[PDB]
Amino acid sequence: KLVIWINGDKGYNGLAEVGKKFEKDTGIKVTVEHPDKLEEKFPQVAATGDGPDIIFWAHDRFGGYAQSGLLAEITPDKAFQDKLYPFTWDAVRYNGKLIAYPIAVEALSLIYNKDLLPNPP
Amino acid sequence: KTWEEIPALDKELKAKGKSALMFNLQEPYFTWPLIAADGNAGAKAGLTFLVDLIKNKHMNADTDYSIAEAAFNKGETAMTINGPWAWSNIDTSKVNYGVTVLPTFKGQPSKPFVGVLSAGINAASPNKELAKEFLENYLLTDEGLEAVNKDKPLGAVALKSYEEELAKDPRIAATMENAQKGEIMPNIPQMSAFWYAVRTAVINAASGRQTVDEALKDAQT
Amino acid sequence: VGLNPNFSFRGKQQTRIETFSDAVFALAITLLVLSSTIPETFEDLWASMRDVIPFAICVALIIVIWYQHYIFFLKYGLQDKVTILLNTILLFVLLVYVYPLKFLARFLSEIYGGIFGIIETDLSRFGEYSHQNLKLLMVNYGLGAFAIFLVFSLMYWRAYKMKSLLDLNSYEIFDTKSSIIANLLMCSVPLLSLIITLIDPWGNFRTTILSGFLYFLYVPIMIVFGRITSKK
Amino acid sequence: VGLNPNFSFRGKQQTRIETFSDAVFALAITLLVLSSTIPETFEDLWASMRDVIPFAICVALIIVIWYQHYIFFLKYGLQDKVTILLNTILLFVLLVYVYPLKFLARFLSEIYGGIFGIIETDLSRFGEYSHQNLKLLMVNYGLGAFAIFLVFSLMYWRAYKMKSLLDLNSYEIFDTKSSIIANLLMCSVPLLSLIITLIDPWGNFRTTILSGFLYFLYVPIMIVFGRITSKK
Ligand SMILES: OC[C@H]1O[C@H](O[C@H]2[C@H](O)[C@@H](O)[C@@H](O)O[C@@H]2CO)[C@H](O)[C@@H](O)[C@@H]1O
Numbered sequence: 001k002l003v004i005w006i007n008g009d010k011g012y013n014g015l016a017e018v019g020k021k022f023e024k025d026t027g028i029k030v031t032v033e034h035p036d037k038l039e040e041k042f043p044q045v046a047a048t049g050d051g052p053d054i055i056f057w058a059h060d061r062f063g064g065y066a067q068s069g070l071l072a073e074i075t076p077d078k079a080f081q082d083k084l085y086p087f088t089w090d091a092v093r094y095n096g097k098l099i100a101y102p103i104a105v106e107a108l109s110l111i112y113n114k115d116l117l118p119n120p121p
Numbered sequence: 122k123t124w125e126e127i128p129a130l131d132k133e134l135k136a137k138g139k140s141a142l143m144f145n146l147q148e149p150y151f152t153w154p155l156i157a158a159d160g161n162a163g164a165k166a167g168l169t170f171l172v173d174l175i176k177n178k179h180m181n182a183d184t185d186y187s188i189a190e191a192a193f194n195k196g197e198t199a200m201t202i203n204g205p206w207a208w209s210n211i212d213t214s215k216v217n218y219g220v221t222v223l224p225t226f227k228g229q230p231s232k233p234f235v236g237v238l239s240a241g242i243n244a245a246s247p248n249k250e251l252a253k254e255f256l257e258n259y260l261l262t263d264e265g266l267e268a269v270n271k272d273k274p275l276g277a278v279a280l281k282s283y284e285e286e287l288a289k290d291p292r293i294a295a296t297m298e299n300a301q302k303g304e305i306m307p308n309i310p311q312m313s314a315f316w317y318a319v320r321t322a323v324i325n326a327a328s329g330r331q332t333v334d335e336a337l338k339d340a341q342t
Numbered sequence: 343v344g345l346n347p348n349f350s351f352r353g354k355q356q357t358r359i360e361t362f363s364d365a366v367f368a369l370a371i372t373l374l375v376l377s378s379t380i381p382e383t384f385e386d387l388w389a390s391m392r393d394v395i396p397f398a399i400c401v402a403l404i405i406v407i408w409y410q411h412y413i414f415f416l417k418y419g420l421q422d423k424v425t426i427l428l429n430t431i432l433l434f435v436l437l438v439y440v441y442p443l444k445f446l447a448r449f450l451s452e453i454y455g456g457i458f459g460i461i462e463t464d465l466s467r468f469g470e471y472s473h474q475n476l477k478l479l480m481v482n483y484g485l486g487a488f489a490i491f492l493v494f495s496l497m498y499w500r501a502y503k504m505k506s507l508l509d510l511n512s513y514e515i516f517d518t519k520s521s522i523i524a525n526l527l528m529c530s531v532p533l534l535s536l537i538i539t540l541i542d543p544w545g546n547f548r549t550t551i552l553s554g555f556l557y558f559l560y561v562p563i564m565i566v567f568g569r570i571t572s573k574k
Numbered sequence: 575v576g577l578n579p580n581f582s583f584r585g586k587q588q589t590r591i592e593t594f595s596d597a598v599f600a601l602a603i604t605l606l607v608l609s610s611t612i613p614e615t616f617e618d619l620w621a622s623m624r625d626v627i628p629f630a631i632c633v634a635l636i637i638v639i640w641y642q643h644y645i646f647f648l649k650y651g652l653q654d655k656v657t658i659l660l661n662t663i664l665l666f667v668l669l670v671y672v673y674p675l676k677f678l679a680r681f682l683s684e685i686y687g688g689i690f691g692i693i694e695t696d697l698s699r700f701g702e703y704s705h706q707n708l709k710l711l712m713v714n715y716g717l718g719a720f721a722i723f724l725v726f727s728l729m730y731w732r733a734y735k736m737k738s739l740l741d742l743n744s745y746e747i748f749d750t751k752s753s754i755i756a757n758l759l760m761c762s763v764p765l766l767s768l769i770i771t772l773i774d775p776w777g778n779f780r781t782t783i784l785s786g787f788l789y790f791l792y793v794p795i796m797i798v799f800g801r802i803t804s805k806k
């Protein structure tokens with residue numbers, strides 16, 4: 001069973017559709033989970049118990065997992081490495097070792113109702 | 122904008138095979154606004170005009186709720202007097218309708234009677250706490266009054282949260298315009314006998330049995 | 343773009359009255375400038391550039407009216423006989439006061455030109471500055487401004503009279519009702535000067551000083567009339 | 575039709591500001607030509623045909639502004655108070671320099687008419703060609719051109735200030751940002767001449783030769799200012 005841990009505020013149903021296409025082409029089940037406080041539940045469960053096969057979280061929490069020895073070193077071929085931006089690969093690098101695959105850049109923004117507020121602050 | 126220019130509009134419309142105004146004359150709730158427009162002299166003045174419309178063959182004698190609604194919805198009459206609840210059936214018909222202020226009579230406005238639809242629990246019921254639950258937690262809610270309003274409109278709902286949705290409706294604005302020109306009905310126990318006295322008085326004067334002066338005489342007793 | 347968020351703009355599609363009305367507006371600001379004589383020499387060139395300050399005031403005033411027109415026909419989208427009538431009364435007034443504004447803008451730019459000390463050119467060119475002419479000056483432009491805002495109030499009330507046909511909601515009724523009071527309050531100041539000049543309490547320049555001084559106290563006097571109606 | 579393939583044109587529907595603005599534009603090119611006197615005889619007829627070269631330059635210049643206006647209101651589709659304001663400042667400038675352009679176009683066509691050797695008619699008709707008049711000539715049209723491009727830059731920045739309301743994408747943000755720099759760079763050359771004429775380093779015609787020579791070095795000086803901002 002391929003089990004994935006990702007936050008409930010992300011596209012887990014969409015990640016499951018990718019997982020369903022994976023089981024069609026290979027035969028491996030892909031369940032997606034979104035437990036509360038997974039950033040601090042992952043290092044406790046993965047250290048002792050089985051936990052997930054893959055963990056999705058912003059790159060800031062991964063240095064602590066890398067120091068603790070809770071993440072396998074990533075070894076992706078050149079062809080795959082070249083598909084992503086070289087700046088994204090740096091964020092997922094701890095002590096000269098790639099510790100995760102970069103998905104996307106996130107940044108908070110001011111969301112505003114144009115009807116209640118056309119010219120916002 | 123005035124009741125006194127309807128006979129002229131009816132003469133103009135009857136030439137094209139159409140009526141000017143058809144509304145329920147049997148129930149006194151619909152005739153009361155015209156009757157209480159000036160005021161007594163105001164009731165005598167108001168009812169004589171209503172009798173003159175029927176005497177001049179502008180309005181039919183036994184105009185009830187069904188033949189007035191059907192006539193407006195079919196497109197046989199230009200106007201009608203009805204409440205919020207009536208709009209859903211017009212929307213269903215292919216009629217481009219508009220809700221507006223009631224016509225003025227003798228300069229002053231027609232004063233309708235403002236009603237408050239209310240749910241009361243029957244004293245001889247064993248399901249009092251089950252009905253309270255239903256009325257409070259299920260009906261009198263944003264979701265509960267929505268389900269009723271989309272079937273047949275409730276009018277200016279009592280729920281504070283609906284204020285913006287009610288203020289977005291052009292027809293609820295006309296309803297509140299008429300409600301301010303009218304007045305709320307006193308809940309008193311004599312309302313039943315009053316409503317009966319006005320119901321009979323209007324029917325007798327409309328059919329042609331009792332005089333307008335003798336109608337207010339029997340109704341004041 | 344729009345004034346209110348609760349307002350639903352009926353006149354978003356362009357119409358004949360709107361097009362026709364823009365055309366007149368464009369002509370007023372254009373002919374006010376281009377009615378001037380064509381410079382044939384450097385002396386005429388420098389003379390014509392002194393006219394920009396007067397013309398800037400004229401255009402600023404005309405587009406402000408064009409804006410209030412644009413906003414009205416954007417809100418209601420009206421196209422009826424009575425709207426066509428009132429609208430013509432408006433563009434008719436605009437049109438008759440175009441050139442008299444060029445005159446007043448030039449006249450006032452020379453008086454203020456003398457006060458600030460920028461220029462020192464004569465004012466004998468403008469005629470005889472007598473009590474009757476200076477009185478007729480106020481009464482004229484006062485009557486002119488009052489008509490414009492009186493017409494705007496009449497147009498908002500025509501929309502209000504057709505509130506059910508336009509399907510105006512409670513927010514749109516209140517805007518329309520407020521826009522009438524706004525334009526009547528704007529037409530109260532020129533009307534009050536005009537009335538004071540015509541009666542002539544002093545029989546001398548003092549009358550014209552007061553009538554002119556009501557325009558400098560525009561905002562405060564508009565607040566007094568507005569407060570009086572709310573206090574009761 | 576359109577400038578960029580990545581740009582999504584918001585102002586594809588025609589509006590009051592656009593209609594009103596076309597009307598003013600059409601009047602400027604029309605009154606520049608038709609403000610001339612009506613030929614009553616063959617002598618007047620041949621005289622009026624000598625005016626085509628000056629008028630061709632005037633119209634060529636006016637439609638270029640009309641184009642930049644058309645493209646702006648096609649891109650963003652704006653209709654707000656601040657856009658209405660800046661737009662009026664624009665059509666106001668256009669309007670005041672219509673006839674002075676007719677003057678400059680005639681004046682420059684007689685100087686170039688004398689150089690190429692096509693005609694040999696006098697230039698005493700135009701006034702006294704003195705240092706102060708020729709200085710005021712530059713300062714005038716320089717101030718005029720600077721204002722036009724300064725306004726265009728102010729309008730692209732107003733759109734940029736409303737980038738989120740218009741829902742501009744990264745390609746549309748870059749176009750808008752580039753259009754500001756483009757119009758500021760266009761307004762830097764008349765501003766630099768104007769500044770050089772007003773200070774007057776030489777106190778003689780040399781000043782006017784330089785100020786005029788910056789227009790012949792328009793493209794190269796626009797590239798110098800552009801390179802300076804990128805080099806740092
Ligand atoms: O006609 C007299 C009748 O009028 C009112 O009843 C209204 C009711 O309030 C409305 O909600 C609607 O149902 O129509 C009724 C008239 O048909 C009074 O409430 C009632 O006492 C009175 O009998």
Ligand SMILES: [K+]
Pocket residue numbers: none
């Ligand atoms: K003329």
Ligand SMILES: [Zn+2]
Pocket residue numbers: none
């Ligand atoms: Zn014209």
